[PDB]
Nucleic acid binder design. Structure first.
Ligand SMILES: [Mg+2]
Ligand SMILES: [Mg+2]
Ligand SMILES: [Mg+2]
Ligand SMILES: [Mg+2]
Ligand SMILES: [Mg+2]
Ligand SMILES: [Mg+2]
Ligand SMILES: [Mg+2]
Ligand SMILES: [Zn+2]
Lengths: 50, 135, 39, 134, 103, 122, 58, 84, 104
RNA sequence: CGACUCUUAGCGGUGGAUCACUCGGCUCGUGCGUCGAUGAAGAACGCAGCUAGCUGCGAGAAUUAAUGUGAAUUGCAGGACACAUUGAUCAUCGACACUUCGAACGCACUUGCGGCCCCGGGUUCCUCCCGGGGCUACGCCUGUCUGAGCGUCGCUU
RNA sequence: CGCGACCUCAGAUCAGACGUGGCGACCCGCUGAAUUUAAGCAUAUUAGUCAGCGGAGGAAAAGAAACUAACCAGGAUUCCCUCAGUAACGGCGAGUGAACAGGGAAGAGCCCAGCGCCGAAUCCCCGCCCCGCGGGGCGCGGGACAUGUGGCGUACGGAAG
RNA sequence: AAGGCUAAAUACCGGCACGAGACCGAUAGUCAACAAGUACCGUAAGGGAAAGUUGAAAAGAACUUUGAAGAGAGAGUUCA
RNA sequence: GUGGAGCCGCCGCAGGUGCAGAUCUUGGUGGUAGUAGCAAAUAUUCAAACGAGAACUUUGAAGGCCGAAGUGGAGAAGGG
């Protein structure tokens, strides 16, 4: 908003760090079945709702 | 007696249930008195109470209470029954002599609507279908 | 990445538009044109 | 027949305790038999295999009179790697093809201070089985 | 709903009865739970007799049953008075006492 | 350079905190090695020094809580974290002494009329 | 630097003067949007930064 | 005016996140929460929805301290240390 | 069928709208948002007449028939035609009520 | 002649039925039956060499100590192999520690504003001067201290 | 006018305790429908159930007769089998609906106020010790509680001298 | 009678562990065998999914060649 | 013929027991059909460059538009 409180932007900082693809050294690991981050959020499609 | 807590006396149901104004609250007023004494002092244990006056609108009961953690109570094994944690809040469960007069229990032909334990323990046992294993 | 628009991304999504197609169409009876048939 | 009412017999639950085993239980289920010579010198049947035991493969594609030491013990995949049995990749790189230690016969143990006492505990309990025969 | 010559019947199933249902599947399990509560009560006590104290001869009430003899509750202090044993001594002799019983 | 906690117990408090702040210096300058390009042999050193820094803080806290539990031993009114935890309901039971108390009427009753053992054949 | 988020500028002023043995003129902090606090610590003109940075690694 | 153009004026927020349950149900003007009812001392739960209890009862969090109590029970809640 | 397959909020769409009058699940977003809910036709529905644990599992036989059956099971275990026609190889065996002494 | 159409058959494609599998449910039963002011359940935030989730943890943060165990963890690196030091890993867990909100407790909830007591340095300090420590919620019981009353009374004046 | 005693009450970040909140399958106290059934519908039924609220415990509640009986009489409570779909209730319609004997499972009984007696013979707190581990005391000395009644022996099966 | 205590037999679709089944076999069985009360939806109370399987072992197709690459043609692994 | 690890007959026993329809449920795919459509707010053109590749990128020249209640320059709320 550019006028936001602290508990908003450390909530927003958390959502921004966990929007990242899988590192490519886990596809090589033993017995996983993950092949892409499926909790990825894009800022136009899906919004947090504050 | 109690008035039924409903807006403008409209109970919205069958005509037997229009009872806004003649309703009598099946637990006694002394039992109400002991209840909100052991609700204010939640650390104290309640023993029983007695009558010391009534006017026309107010009714005065002396409720006698017990500190369960005073060492004059936690010694003396004739009083150690109430420092045992099943006696916590005896009037919220209706276990004192004021409150148990409304449970309707007692031995006899006049009281066998509650013939196992309580009223709703009899009802569960008169209305369970006790289908056996070989039947 | 060198293999992230090729081996991360083609897994990443590629079926995410599949939100229901139709969610009912709650537009309340499209026969708004009063017809009423001879009464 | 099982008689204990406190141990399972179901397929779903012994498999679940197999693949989700703790890593110190998992060295016990990756045990390997001693050779006919070496089970007579120690009067013990089988042992859990460790990193530097000399061993030959008794069944598989790679088998038959091939004493050679283990070099790596994958407990996660229940697999030992042995320093000679190998396989060229498509690249030309050579890797260790891995095998299960029940398909394997120890021909020379690696003794330390602890693998003396593991042998003596498994040996002394075997006379007690013979002492039951009265 | 009725038909030819039949019984007029009142099944008392007009009430939500599938919640208040009782199945006796634990009933073999409770028979070996109160045998083990008798065995571990027999060996726990003493050479004192199992199944507790001595009960009296008692005749049943109510015309239908007054020709039979039943085991009772205690021993009715007058009977303890004539036999010569004390009322508080008697229940560690193995003798049941019912003070409210009349002779 | 390994650190064993069994070795650290015979040390002094003026030696432990000197050896602890010594370890905080290496953990400061290894974090610098990660924010630069890197010296990756020193990027696996960071985990074994941050677990070494917990071993010193543990022996400081274990030789203070038990250095102080020996002070309030034999004392009424010891602090709350030294009292036994045991669950909230265990502290509100009577104790093993008060649960053995019998009144004097029920004591003479037990010594005049004790439980006898017997059997019934002859 | 990057500072722990519960530190005010007095604590930063003493925790850089004591670790690195330098006089501190003023500090300007910031919460950068990953969630970590960044501090801009200016030195006294008696000191220099390009050589203090050399002895702290970079 | 009834439909899509009245969605443009939706500009200021009714609920923000609650400090006790983290829900975006803390109404700013009523000063109460939707799910927990925060400035009341007790937790809001009702038997007319069995799913709402399934979301937030015990066993759905870390259980930072009942993990330990469930473990300390099966030894009788010891206080003194082990022998060497 | 544990509690029920009835832990779903669902009403019939009712009116026109060119769908069958089965109940549909509520809400939007998710896949399961306009699909046929409970009733023995639907993916995720509730089975017809869900089995109950108070089925009469156990049968009574009066004891004179239990004893009758065990006398007929012993008299046929001595006839060599009936014991071999159940498959027991008793070709080489001696006398059909095999009796070994109490030392065994 | 070719094309189009139709029906069959081969092959190929689309699609994911069937079958075979199962670290999952479901039912029944047994044994115990244990939260919290000594800060619970729950929530938020953070923690790994490369680490988003899940799982596990709390600035000692992908775990410390102890005991038991006895050579690994492993996707790749790195590192001590030392074990007649102390010994990797894993399990047990009885020792320690356990951010922020929360019954949540100085007051507010705006990371907002304090009050006393103490400690290390600055005015060597009172009268509002940096950091750190401690304490400050309500109801209530027993005891204490302070003392209110044209309440009851005494000794007085 | 002052001081004292007591009696009614205040205050405290006083020394020390306690309570709050969660879970809630089972249990206790309250509160409470309507769909439904009656081929309509009011009483009735659904149902004293659902939802609501409050208290627990590993069990809870009940529990040692102001009982049943009516005869050769049984003898606390709880559970089970029968009684019994019975007596009874009911637009006597739809429907509802116990108990006592009897057979079992388990079995255990007690205390108090009162009335009298004993020089308050009683209890709590603080201080230093007998002497101790893993801390609670009987002993010693002070402050209170308490005669408006602590304690002992006594409980209707009688009790005391 | 208008005061009080009390074990056992009884209850238990939550919890912590167990054991079993003429049970279901991935549109079934828990909503959920999988990063499931998750993604997503709704201002909210709340609604709430889909998604198991290469091989015995990655031995997951080096290399040559066409193409800007996707994509091929040979070769190669493997019982396949 | 494919496939690669289990299966069937008879005698009794037991069912969540056989589908063409339910505007059935769920998933899949057709015809329509290479069709309807890619039509509000006047407008583009030339050369060069970069490029595997230019109606659409950038650059330059031209012609135009918004025309100061702007198609300009800043913010609040909301987004993150
Ligand atoms: Mg029958
Ligand atoms: Mg199983
Ligand atoms: Mg408050
Ligand atoms: Mg499918
Ligand atoms: Mg350790
Ligand atoms: Mg402070
Ligand atoms: Mg409890
Ligand atoms: Zn909330």
């Amino acid at each position: 908003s550019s006028h936001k409180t602290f508990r908003i932007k450390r909530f927003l900082a958390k959502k921004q760090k966990q929007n990242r693809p899988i590192p490519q050294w886990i596809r090589m690991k033993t017995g996983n079945k993950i092949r892409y981050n499926s909790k990825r959020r894009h800022w136009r499609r899906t919004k947090l709702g504050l | 007696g109690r008035k039924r807590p409903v807006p403008k006396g409209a109970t919205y149901g069958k005509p037997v249930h229009h009872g806004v104004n003649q309703l009598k609250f099946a637990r006694s007023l002394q039992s109400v008195a002991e209840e909100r004494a052991g609700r204010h002092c939640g650390a104290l244990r309640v023993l029983n109470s007695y009558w010391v006056g009534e006017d026309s609108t107010y009714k005065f009961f002396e409720v006698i209470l017990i500190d369960p953690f005073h060492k004059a109570i936690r010694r003396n094994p004739d009083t150690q029954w109430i420092t045992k944690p099943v006696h916590k809040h005896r009037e919220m469960r209706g276990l004192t002599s004021a409150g148990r007069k409304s449970r309707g229990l007692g031995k006899g032909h006049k009281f066998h609507h509650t013939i196992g334990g309580s009223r709703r323990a009899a009802w569960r046992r008169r209305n369970t279908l006790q289908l056996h294993r070989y039947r | 990445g060198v293999c992230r628009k090729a081996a991360q991304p083609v897994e990443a999504g590629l079926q995410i538009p599949a939100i229901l197609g139709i969610l009912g169409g709650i537009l309340a009876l499209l026969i708004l044109i009063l017809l009423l048939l001879l009464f | 027949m099982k008689f204990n009412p406190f141990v399972t017999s179901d397929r779903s639950k012994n498999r679940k305790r197999h693949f989700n085993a703790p890593s110190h239980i998992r060295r016990k289920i990756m045990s390997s038999p001693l050779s006919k010579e070496l089970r007579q010198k120690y009067n013990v049947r089988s042992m859990p295999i460790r990193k530097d035991d000399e061993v030959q493969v008794v069944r598989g594609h790679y088998k038959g009179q091939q004493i050679g030491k283990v070099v790596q013990v994958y407990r996660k995949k229940y697999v030992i790697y042995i320093e000679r049995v190998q396989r060229e990749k498509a690249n030309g790189t050579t890797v260790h093809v891995g095998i299960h230690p029940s398909k394997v016969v120890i021909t020379r143990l690696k003794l330390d201070k602890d693998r003396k006492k593991i042998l003596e505990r498994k040996a002394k309990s075997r006379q007690v089985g013979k002492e039951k025969g009265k | 709903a009725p038909s030819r010559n039949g019984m007029v019947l009142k099944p008392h199933f007009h009430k939500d009865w599938q919640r208040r249902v009782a199945t006796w599947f634990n009933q073999p399990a409770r028979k070996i739970r109160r045998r083990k509560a008798r065995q571990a009560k027999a060996r726990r006590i003493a050479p004192r007799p199992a199944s507790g104290p001595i009960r009296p001869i008692v005749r049943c009430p109510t015309v239908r049953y007054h020709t039979k003899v039943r085991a009772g509750r205690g021993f009715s202090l007058e009977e303890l008075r004539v036999a010569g044993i004390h009322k508080k001594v008697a229940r560690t002799i193995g003798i049941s006492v019912d003070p409210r019983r009349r002779n | 350079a390994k650190i064993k906690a069994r070795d650290l117990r015979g040390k002094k408090k003026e030696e432990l905190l000197k050896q602890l702040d010594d370890l905080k210096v290496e953990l400061s300058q290894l974090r610098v090695a990660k924010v630069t390009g890197g010296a990756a042999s020193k990027l696996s050193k960071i985990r074994v020094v941050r677990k070494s820094i917990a071993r010193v803080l543990t022996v400081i806290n274990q030789t203070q809580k038990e250095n102080l539990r020996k002070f309030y031993k034999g004392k009424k009114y010891k602090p709350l974290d030294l009292r036994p935890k045991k669950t909230r309901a265990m502290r509100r039971r009577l104790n093993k002494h008060e649960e053995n108390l019998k009144t004097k009427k029920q004591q003479r009753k037990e010594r005049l009329y004790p439980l006898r053992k017997y059997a019934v054949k002859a | 630097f990057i500072v722990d988020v519960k530190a005010n500028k007095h604590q930063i002023k003493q925790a850089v003067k004591k670790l690195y043995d330098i006089d501190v003129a003023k500090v300007n902090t910031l919460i950068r949007p990953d969630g970590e606090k960044k501090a801009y610590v200016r030195l006294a003109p008696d000191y220099d930064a390009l050589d203090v940075a050399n002895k702290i690694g970079i | 005016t009834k439909g899509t153009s009245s969605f443009g004026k939706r500009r200021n927020k009714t609920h923000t996140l609650c400090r006790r349950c983290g829900s975006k149900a803390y109404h700013l003007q009523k000063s109460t929460c939707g799910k927990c009812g925060y400035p009341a001392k007790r937790k809001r739960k009702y038997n007319w929805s069995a799913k709402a209890k399934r979301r937030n009862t015990t066993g759905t969090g870390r259980m930072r301290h009942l993990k330990i109590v469930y473990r300390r029970f099966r030894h009788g809640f010891r206080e003194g240390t082990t022998p060497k | 069928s544990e509690l029920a397959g009835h832990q779903t909020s669902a009403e019939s769409w009712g009116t026109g709208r060119a769908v069958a009058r089965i109940p549909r699940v509520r809400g939007g977003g998710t896949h399961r948002s306009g699909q046929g809910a409970f009733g023995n036709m639907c993916r995720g529905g509730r089975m017809f007449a869900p089995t109950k644990t108070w089925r009469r599992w156990h049968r009574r036989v009066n004891t004179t028939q239990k004893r009758y059956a065990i006398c007929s099971a012993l008299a046929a275990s001595a006839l060599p035609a009936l014991v071999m026609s159940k498959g027991h190889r008793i070709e080489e065996v001696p006398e059909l009520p095999l009796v070994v002494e109490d030392k065994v």
